[PDB]
Structure 1
């Protein structure tokens, strides 16, 4: 009644707060906590830090910490424990290159038990928002470091947060219980069991049978026709949030024939996205015309959508010299067929379904898309090294969008750098992304985001497909299930059946 059972496609991992896979971000966020806490309005509030000051040049910050917080094993949280966490994270600095605060922090020291001083290389504006992320700047008890580090593993995953990992059984389940000595608000739920169920259909079956009480996740959570059925079944409860991030193709500007602007612009008019969403996504998601929805901070720019218009796509191709050989449906230019490889995770039925639609729509304008569905490791390798024509991709949701997603475009081992590498203006874009991150002149910050997002739109680097939502299927007794401000978090401590 105050215990729930839910599911996740894999175990939560070791819950090292400072590492990535196989740790699951939402589980790191249940056990470990930040200095400051992200809010839906884009601000942060005091959290383990009660307050803070900064220097006039914006580079030196001093946080006053709570003095009443203990880790779940009774050891105190104080500035020394925080400073040792920052050292453990930055001892592995290379791994966090995607996150610009990890390159900005030049020193962290405890000035006393309650005062923590962080010095930055520059006046990095997103500092507090990156400190609020699920990882890596959250705090494990230093006693649980292994030989004074975390990058080589941890002992027990001891955090300050409202949940404690009770036990994990690999390939089976993970069980958390409420922290009875939490410094903040006491959750209503006392125990949460996660059953490991990798297949979406099997998840839906688990819920119908009553084996689980709650499913919570993005558009991959369960089959969408099933979800629509469940939303009409008065024995169940369902929800669909307002959109949290964009799903899009990345087009390789450095690889033929996507290296041609006119080919990328044509592809951007070839897909009927509303039909795609109604055919493959059961009508449950929203059409996307831009990298970021106009509701994302800094991104209400009046960018012009490319509406589905196969006549215009064909015209653009014809004008660029891609015309149809006698008796053939696939265009050719300089003897080369207009062929494009579309990469995605082959096991993933929803991705395959979308890819088949996109392939069919692009065949109608004379582009031959070849589907390359591979296991996830091979797709991630392709993202990193630029071995793709088109690849499925997504943004990151709040509080990463847009700043941190844009920051990462500079990192060479990410899909977006690779996709953009054929642009003559790539250096300028990357210089402008560095400038926007440290700008405190609000007019210049808006102007730099407008320039970067407008160049990316006008160069047709992406094919935005949908703004996707979180969705929930639950037993009615759990009541209304809230959403967290951070798109990757699950706010279990806010569920309040009574």
Structure 2
């Protein structure tokens, strides 16, 4: 059946609560649940569940006119009351969404009629529409599936308005979705999608080679990159590599010795040949990153000066900061303390380990001793929240989060970016300007604030940008060309057309 496909994912999709995070998988929430406005690749949003909208002079009161023909997959109507109830359910858990500034901005949501939905904001929050378009949390489950009129304590059935319906889930085995035959929009050509739960990238590759699965879709960890290169040459297969979607980097802890020293952070940024790293560990499949955000990211084309690979300059910077080589040793010392930096990473991630070994070797060449701390996933996430790291692998979030939402989250102390920035003397200024950039409606001032925030982060060498990574696809040829979604975390199954 050419209208039924089998793919894979490292874990189950989760319960598909539209308003919660782990272990819900974002792409799967986006398959079932829909936004008021839909994000487009050009950076705009289009009408979706909302046909149209107006806003007040002061930018704080927004009124959406909703479609009147939309049903949840269980036949119950989608109207302004159902939408308002969803906003209430989300904001009843407001603390958990405070990383996303819109969750702190919404004062009230009212259904003025079946088709009129009014949303009032604290301030004139410019990324309002783009954050409504995110996969979560502002998407809509049928209110009949709330538990005690809430969603934060669980849901009943995951009933959305979207083009896919979860048929069944089997923990550690599979998830099955089917086409919504009563979808308000266009019918997908695919009728059934089976997700096999396959946690290991080599095992995913083997599953494709045997014919067990029709499609692999993911980022640079989807499968071994040496295997992907071979697949791309195989005339029996189809492969794709998108244009870059987000940045992979190291975050350097400005609050912990010795990365608290600007000279040390600058020297680290001169010591890595990123092209060689990409050609070594990533088999040349990704692009070199000189800045936190690629120049193609909105508001980020600033002409920031790259720190090109220059081990001679890296050594000179350390020497001038007092980090010199003792007799017969390769690791520098200052006041008898060795230049030692801990790099923690997920120890079972072979790609992360490979890049870690490359970074360790590169930094030894300029006299810095990198200790590799490979730990389980839970421990690494705890380290990121607590700032218990010297260096960590880190990534941006792709459109439409980059740059406004990623920057906004830098103010939240329980995440890696704040922790890495905590030792900066101008961190209060940076957090102040991040608050201003989200609220100001002077577009000249908005661009000037983005420039200042990103220039400070660049000049202070908080990050060591490594690569701009791409989405990758491996598929049976009969599926045809596989499209990409405007939102980097979504998979546009409804656009596959065999």
Give the TM-score range, shorter chain.
over 0.9
Please name the residue that 1:491 is paired with: 492
RMSD: 0.3
Query: Whole-Å Cα distance in 2 between the matches of residues 426 and 107 of structure 1?
Result: 32
Query: Whole-Å Cα distance in 2 between the matches of residues 257 and 324 of structure 1?
Result: 16
SS in 1 for 2:467: strand
Query: Whole-Å Cα distance in 2 between the matches of residues 405 and 226 of structure 1?
Result: 32
| Cα drift, residue 491 of structure 1 | 0.2
| Cα drift, residue 131 of structure 1 | 0.1
| Cα drift, residue 335 of structure 1 | 1.1
Query: Whole-Å Cα distance in 1 between the matches of residues 218 and 187 of structure 2?
Result: 24
Q: Deviations over 1:378-410 (max 9, x none)?
A: 101110111000000000000000000000000
Query: Whole-Å Cα distance in 1 between the matches of residues 374 and 98 of structure 2?
Result: 29
| Cα drift, residue 98 of structure 1 | 0.7
| Cα drift, residue 325 of structure 1 | 0.4
Query: Whole-Å Cα distance in 1 between the matches of residues 93 and 384 of structure 2?
Result: 23
Q: Which consecutive unaligned segments of at least 5 residues does structure 1 have?
A: none
| Cα drift, residue 439 of structure 1 | 1.4
Query: Whole-Å Cα distance in 1 between the matches of residues 59 and 346 of structure 2?
Result: 43
SS in 1 for 2:409: helix
Runs of at least 4 residues off by over 2 Å? none
Q: Deviations over 1:7-33 (max 9, x none)?
A: 000000000000000000000000000
SS in 2 for 1:314: helix
Query: Whole-Å Cα distance in 2 between the matches of residues 198 and 282 of structure 1?
Result: 22
Please name the residue that 1:99 is paired with: 100
Query: Whole-Å Cα distance in 2 between the matches of residues 222 and 211 of structure 1?
Result: 15
Query: Whole-Å Cα distance in 2 between the matches of residues 135 and 191 of structure 1?
Result: 24
SS in 1 for 2:233: coil
SS in 1 for 2:444: helix
Query: Whole-Å Cα distance in 1 between the matches of residues 356 and 105 of structure 2?
Result: 39
| Cα drift, residue 434 of structure 1 | 0.2
The alignment covers a number of residue pairs equal to: 497
Q: Which consecutive unaligned segments of at least 5 residues does structure 2 have?
A: none
Query: Whole-Å Cα distance in 2 between the matches of residues 124 and 227 of structure 1?
Result: 43
Q: TM-score when scaled to structure 2? A: 1.00
| Cα drift, residue 440 of structure 1 | 1.2
SS in 2 for 1:171: coil
| Cα drift, residue 110 of structure 1 | 0.3
Query: Whole-Å Cα distance in 1 between the matches of residues 7 and 14 of structure 2?
Result: 16
Query: Whole-Å Cα distance in 2 between the matches of residues 443 and 247 of structure 1?
Result: 29
SS in 1 for 2:381: helix
| Cα drift, residue 338 of structure 1 | 0.1
Q: Deviations over 1:405-455 (max 9, x none)?
A: 000000000100000000000000000000000111110000000000000
| Cα drift, residue 457 of structure 1 | 0.1
Q: How does 1:147-166 map to 2 (within 5 A)?
A: 147-166=148-167
Query: Whole-Å Cα distance in 1 between the matches of residues 83 and 33 of structure 2?
Result: 12
SS in 2 for 1:37: strand
Please name the residue that 2:116 is paired with: 115
Please name the residue that 1:401 is paired with: 402
Q: TM-score when scaled to structure 1? A: 1.00
Query: Whole-Å Cα distance in 2 between the matches of residues 111 and 399 of structure 1?
Result: 29
Q: Deviations over 1:155-185 (max 9, x none)?
A: 0000000000000000000000000000000
Query: Whole-Å Cα distance in 2 between the matches of residues 460 and 172 of structure 1?
Result: 44
| Cα drift, residue 334 of structure 1 | 1.1
Please name the residue that 2:246 is paired with: 245
| Cα drift, residue 88 of structure 1 | 0.2
SS in 1 for 2:220: coil
SS in 2 for 1:410: coil
Q: Deviations over 1:262-285 (max 9, x none)?
A: 000000000010000000000000
Query: Whole-Å Cα distance in 2 between the matches of residues 35 and 376 of structure 1?
Result: 34
SS in 2 for 1:327: coil
Q: Deviations over 1:113-171 (max 9, x none)?
A: 00000000000000000000000000000000000000000000000000000000000
Q: Deviations over 1:321-355 (max 9, x none)?
A: 00000011000001110000001111100000000
Q: Deviations over 1:300-330 (max 9, x none)?
A: 0000000111111000000100000001100
| Cα drift, residue 365 of structure 1 | 0.4
Query: Whole-Å Cα distance in 1 between the matches of residues 186 and 116 of structure 2?
Result: 24
Q: Deviations over 1:175-233 (max 9, x none)?
A: 00000000000000000000000000000000000000000000000000000000000
Query: Whole-Å Cα distance in 2 between the matches of residues 469 and 214 of structure 1?
Result: 17
| Cα drift, residue 104 of structure 1 | 0.4
Query: Whole-Å Cα distance in 2 between the matches of residues 223 and 375 of structure 1?
Result: 20
Query: Whole-Å Cα distance in 2 between the matches of residues 414 and 404 of structure 1?
Result: 13
Q: Deviations over 1:42-72 (max 9, x none)?
A: 0000000000000000000000000000000
SS in 1 for 2:230: helix
